């Protein structure tokens, strides 16, 4: 009964276009394919915008006011979005490829590099009510005879410097009256002019060329004219200038070369501040902060993004995404971290709160097919097509064990026992499930009985039974632990593609090739429910198709499914443009999500392969926090969450229940009534207001009297609220009072409080213990210093 919205895109920090810094300097805007990601450098957070282009973004820009963001794709279709409210304002089609877009520092105008033309437009007014046709064109300029590489605004918004592949830099006046002031073209460079910049006083102009030459232009007498007074050269052996940026206030010049290295220079002295290398791929985009202290670089080939603090030679941000599509994903048991794997063969560990990669593992030679955590959570296992299964200790970030078959079997699926003592893998070529001992690393035995390749495995987190399904049109339940081994095969109408264990361990759901999700009772081994999915799935006609989408049967089944931790929902995805969320007990579709709106991707709408990227979801999982689910796709890891919660969803509401009446009860000191009415309304602002208004002396009284029905919901509220709240002791007092008062009830119903307790344990472990760990170290460090004999 939750509404999920796309929140952020992990696994991709930069694909192409230009990166920009916020005017305050505290945020970085990076194009990620079709969408724009915003990184909070100070708060170490990140979000991705929900709006979406038809194609990949080419150029973006944010005005100095911080109110308007303009993004333009590769065919010239622009989207104007209110940056603060994150809502799209207008769409405009400039009908030409735009290389660069820049706001004037005044913000009234923005300039467009379109072919060999410079278009100046008037910026729409954000404050005003939404206009039907807001874009009015200011001026158009045509001097260049060849495409414009870049453009630069003057600090006073009165002049623009445009550089083109005509080996020329050209200056324009934004006011017609001042045309005589600046109507000059600067020649002299032997290659493409990549950047032209004003000095801070604007008396001097610096032009940079692709060949690696910097010219200093001054207005001087031989009666007065612009002349090259000084010439500097980057003596790169073969590297060419790829991107250049300048900061007039601090006179900093940052140049990124095609060899993958960048230099920082001081002008006009040309003093090389520093020289570093990001790799062997071209540096595509370079940006400078408003204060000039942070430098952002981006390489498109490997999708690297680097924020460099050259003052202290420190790294604010240093991230590289997956080169290939993410094949699998796995949440940490508490939901603090998510592990991803790629067809390349490298695993990356991500932190949910920050959205940045903590470690990358490159032990696997071939594509990693599955990653899974143990119930303990410190250990992670991965299976790969290279023929190995590896165990990773995520406290010390080390591959402490490798499992392999006798004959190098390609593993596609993986399952780990709840006790973390048995690991099982399956293959498309062997038909046998290999079992290893975690402690010893030796093959225990091979579970035989499937006639077809094994598609999917899972242990029950509680019962510890193993379910395996295959293209043999059957599912087998293995009771491997115990003195005797039993197997129970259940027949299914079609090949089984995906499989999921209900968190209770009493039912298993399978997705088949006929587009059916069938739920079976494990103990009785009989079907208990079924869901149709063919009609719900959305699949687009591929450009190469010679048959219609409606007649097409390419992918009308789900290749991956997962239970919600409540057990009442299943999220499903496949080789299609749909992620469907079904309600198991009612067998109805809750909601359908469109994965991409990129017209480039194939599924959105004779020796040589006609192969081009297509949209597909490789893995889905629910967050153990019960607020989000993540879907691994070609573009990256899409995370949908319920954080905003604008919905009004009251519970057991009555006429006498009102936000005013809740506040009245607080003023009357009726804390139990106020808290209950706040939950019945189910308004986050009101629950927070009542929650913090209850005095410490009254908490044990209120906690003891909470009705049982509201107990799971308040426990959920504290766990989610405490993780990011500053009131550590206040939230700890509340948890202790609830646990001490309703501990027996929670024990009687573990499944009902499974997600609430897990969120609480995340807070007590990931923040509360770490605070105490610092405080206790100072206690013992202090005792040693004072109690001990000092040196002579």
């Amino acid at each position: 009964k939750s509404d999920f919205k796309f929140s952020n895109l992990l696994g991709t920090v930069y694909r192409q276009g230009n990166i920009t810094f916020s005017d305050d300097g505290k945020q970085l805007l990076s194009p990620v394919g079709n969408r724009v990601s915003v990184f909070d450098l100070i708060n170490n957070k990140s979000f991705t915008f929900e709006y979406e282009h038809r194609k990949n973004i080419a150029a973006i820009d944010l005005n100095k006011q911080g109110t308007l963001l303009i993004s333009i794709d590769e065919d010239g279709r622009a989207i104007l979005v209110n940056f603060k409210a994150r809502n799209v304002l207008h769409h405009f089609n400039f009908k030409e490829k735009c290389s660069a877009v820049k706001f004037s520092p005044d913000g009234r105008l923005f300039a467009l590099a379109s072919g060999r033309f410079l278009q100046i437009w008037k910026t729409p007014d954000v404050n005003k009510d939404r206009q039907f046709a807001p874009f009015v064109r200011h001026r158009v300029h045509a001097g260049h005879f060849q495409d414009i590489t870049s453009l630069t605004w003057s600090q006073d918004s009165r002049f623009i410097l445009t550089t083109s592949k005509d080996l020329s830099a050209k200056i324009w006046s934004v006011d017609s009256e001042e045309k005589n002031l600046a109507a000059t073209t600067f020649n002299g460079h032997r290659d493409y002019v990549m950047g032209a910049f004003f000095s801070h006083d604007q008396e001097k102009i610096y032009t940079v060329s692709k060949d690696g030459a910097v010219f200093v232009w001054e207005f001087t007498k031989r009666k007065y004219s612009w002349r090259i007074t000084k010439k500097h050269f980057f003596y790169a052996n073969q590297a060419k200038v790829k991107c250049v940026t300048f900061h007039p206030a601090t006179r900093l010049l940052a140049v990124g070369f095609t060899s993958g290295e960048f230099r920082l220079y001081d002008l006009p002295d040309f003093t090389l501040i520093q020289q570093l290398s990001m790799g062997q791929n071209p540096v595509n985009t370079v940006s400078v902060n408003q204060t000039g202290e942070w430098l952002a670089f981006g390489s498109s080939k490997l999708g690297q993004l680097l924020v460099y603090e050259w003052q202290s030679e420190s790294y604010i941000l240093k991230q590289q995404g997956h080169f290939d599509s993410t094949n699998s994903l796995a949440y940490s048991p508490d939901g603090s971290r998510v592990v991803t794997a790629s067809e390349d063969g490298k695993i990356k560990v991500w932190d949910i709160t920050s959205g940045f990669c903590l470690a990358t593992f490159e032990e696997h030679t071939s594509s990693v097919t599955a990653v899974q955590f143990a119930k303990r959570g410190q250990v992670m296992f991965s299976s790969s097509l290279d023929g190995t299964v590896r165990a990773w200790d995520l406290i010390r970030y080390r591959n402490f064990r490798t499992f392999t078959g006798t004959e190098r079997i390609q593993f596609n699926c993986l399952a780990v026992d709840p006790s973390g003592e048995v690991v099982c893998a399956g293959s498309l070529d062997n038909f046998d499930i290999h079992v290893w001992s975690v402690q010893t690393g030796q093959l225990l035995d091979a579970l035989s009985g499937h006639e077809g390749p094994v598609s999917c495995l899972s242990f029950s987190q509680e019962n510890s039974v193993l379910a395996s399904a295959s293209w043999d049109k059957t599912i087998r339940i293995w009771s491997i632990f115990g003195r005797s081994q039993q197997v129970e095969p259940i027949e299914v109408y079609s090949d089984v593609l995906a499989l999921s264990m209900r968190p209770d361990g009493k039912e298993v759901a399978v997705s088949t090739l006929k587009g059916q999700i069938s739920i079976f009772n494990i103990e009785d081994a009989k079907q208990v429910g079924n869901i149709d999915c063919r009609k719900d799935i959305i699949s687009g006609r591929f450009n190469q198709d010679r048959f219609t989408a409606k007649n097409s049967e390419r992918s009308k089944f789900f290749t991956t499914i997962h239970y919600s931790f409540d057990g009442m929902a299943i999220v499903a995805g496949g080789n299609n443009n749909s992620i469907c969320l079904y309600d198991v007990p009612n067998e109805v579709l809750l909601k359908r999500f469109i994965v991409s709106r990129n017209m480039a991707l194939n599924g959105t709408l004779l020796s040589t392969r006609k192969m081009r990227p297509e949209v597909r979801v490789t893995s889905v999982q629910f967050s153990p926090t019960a607020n989000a689910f993540a879907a691994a796709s070609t573009e990256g890891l899409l995370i949908y969450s319920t954080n905003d919660t604008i919905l009004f969803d009251p519970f057991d509401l009555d006429v006498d229940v009102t936000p005013h009446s809740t506040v009245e009860a607080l003023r009357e000191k009726q804390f139990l009534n106020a808290l209950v009415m706040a939950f019945r309304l189910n308004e986050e602002y009101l629950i927070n207001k009542v929650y913090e208004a209850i005095p410490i002396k009254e908490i044990p009284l209120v906690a003891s009297n909470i009705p049982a029905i509201y107990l799971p919901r308040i426990l959920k509220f504290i766990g989610d609220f405490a993780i990011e709240s500053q009131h550590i002791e206040f939230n700890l007092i509340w948890i202790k009072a609830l646990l001490s008062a309703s501990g027996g009830y929670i024990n009687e119903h573990k499944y009902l409080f499974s997600t609430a307790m897990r969120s609480i344990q995340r807070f007590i472990v990931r923040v509360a213990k770490e605070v105490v760990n610092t405080t206790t170290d100072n206690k013992y460090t202090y005792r040693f210093l004072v109690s001990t004999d000092g040196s002579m």
Partner: peptide, 14 residues
Amino acid sequence: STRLKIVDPYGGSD
């Protein structure tokens, strides 16, 4: 000269 004079719904008012 050096200047496109385009009369369109979005510009050329002057």
